[PDB]
Design a protein around this ligand. Structure first.
Ligand code: KFV
Ligand code: KFV
Ligand code: CL
Ligand code: CL
Ligand code: CO
Ligand code: CO
Ligand code: NH4
Ligand code: NH4
Lengths: 144, 144
């Protein structure tokens, strides 16, 4: 089951400037930063709240590491803004299989590595009324 | 202080079809529906989780009631997808004043009526790295 909003994926040209904007404006601090070479991003997670399923909700700020990447292509076409939304689950493999069986395109056969060791997959935005939709299971199993 | 992600504002051409998509695909049910004539939307709130500040996190699906509206103009230009993100606070008036004092454009002098009697304001997307950003205080005061 999808039990939380895990994060909002926000594309930006300059991660350090955008991180500072969120700190200065709202007082949101950096929970974690990393580079995901497979996905072609440098990201920062800003934790906003904890959630009733034992997880948390973050802003995920993403700058591209290369133009030939999902985020690099999208920023070139659309400029900075919301790129995707992510829902959390205790079993991304099972939820992804159930959604595949409804005819929504699941982009990965098998979940891939995401932020902080998470396992992630995506649903095609053209099957989700224009919203690129991520499904994520956190690496650290959570206590509701 | 902004203590939660309150909702993701998602624009759609047909609220009833998009509501059914989220029910059929993810099992998300309608928490509330209403029309906000001032804003020019028909909306559905789908509750995803509760939050650690005593609030909740929703998907807010929005269809325009008129073409000459924020959402009607945006859908005409961009098609269906994420339109805004909303952060919750126990004091939208005070948080809005503090953010006004940083030179970010606050669109309302005084918060306006939003979903389920909430009080809302917006920050200009061009001052927030391309993200239309809502600040909301729920009508029902919340217990962390
Ligand atoms: C590390 C991590 C992350 O979140 S990494 C985030 C970056 N990674 C991802 O986004 C991977 C999944 N996304 C993708 O593989 C691709 O972006 C998509 C789904 C395949 C689309 O790639 P395409 O190369 O096909 O892009 P393309 O520009 O060709 O566009 C194909 C169609 O998809 C639409 N589209 C593309 N990106 C979109 C987006 N982010 N939201 C909505 N619509 C989108 C686009 O406008 C076009 O619609 P149109 O036909 O009406 O013009 N984490 O831990 O959470
Ligand atoms: C009931 C409720 C709701 O949430 S009601 C949701 C609908 N209401 C709202 O969105 C009200 C606040 N928004 C607005 O007043 C307006 O949409 C905005 C901020 C003023 C923009 O209105 P404008 O008429 O100026 O739109 P316009 O197309 O002229 O565009 C002005 C600039 O803003 C950009 N823009 C407009 N809407 C945008 C959006 N949703 N996200 C990001 N950028 C946006 C747009 O692309 C353009 O950038 P560019 O210069 O790079 O081209 N609730 O309870 O939570
Ligand atoms: Cl890596
Ligand atoms: Cl009304
Ligand atoms: Co993500
Ligand atoms: Co809203
Ligand atoms: N740029
Ligand atoms: N349409």
């Amino acid at each position: 089951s999808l039990t939380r909003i895990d994060h909002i994926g926000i594309a930006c040209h300059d991660l350090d400037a955008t991180v500072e904007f969120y700190r200065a404006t709202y007082g949101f601090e950096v929970f974690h930063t990393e580079v995901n070479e497979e996905q072609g991003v440098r990201l920062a997670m800003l934790k906003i709240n904890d959630t009733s399923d034992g997880g948390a909700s973050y802003l995920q700020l993403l700058e591209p590491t290369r133009e030939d990447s999902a985020v690099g292509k999208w920023l070139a076409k659309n400029g900075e803004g919301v790129h995707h939304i992510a829902f959390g689950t205790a079993d991304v493999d099972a939820d992804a299989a159930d959604i595949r069986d409804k005819g929504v395109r699941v982009l990965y056969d098998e979940p891939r590595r995401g932020s902080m060791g998470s396992r992630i997959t995506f649903l095609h935005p053209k099957d989700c009324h224009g919203v690129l939709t991520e499904l994520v299971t956190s690496a650290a199993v959570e206590s509701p």
